[PDB]
């Protein structure tokens, strides 16, 4: 027996594109692929010491789906949580 992934599908944002928005994807062994979403926000990010810039567009029903849909969705067989989650810290 071993873990064994099918496909993988999900929300990201990029740190590089942070201020650019938010993006769709899904990888499965084919292929991988990415799109744009559609609830668009004028975010602009920066880090000091302790100070930021703020600008957080969010909506009422638009919020109301992503506080949800915001992670990811994987298939297989023999799956476990605590593989799963440190696979995903050690990414970034």
């Excluded at 000091?48 to 067989?77: C, P, Q, R």
């Amino acid at each position: 027996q071993a873990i064994k992934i099918d496909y993988v599908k999900g929300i990201l944002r990029y740190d590089s594109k942070l201020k650019e928005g938010l993006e769709e994807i899904t990888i499965t062994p084919n292929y991988f692929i990415e799109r744009t979403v559609k609830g668009v926000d004028a975010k602009e990010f920066t880090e000091e010491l302790n100070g930021v810039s703020f600008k957080n567009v969010k909506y009422t029903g638009i919020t109301n789906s992503i506080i949800n849909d915001m992670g990811f969705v994987f298939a297989g067989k023999n799956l476990n949580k605590e593989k799963l989650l440190e696979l995903l810290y050690k990414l970034v």
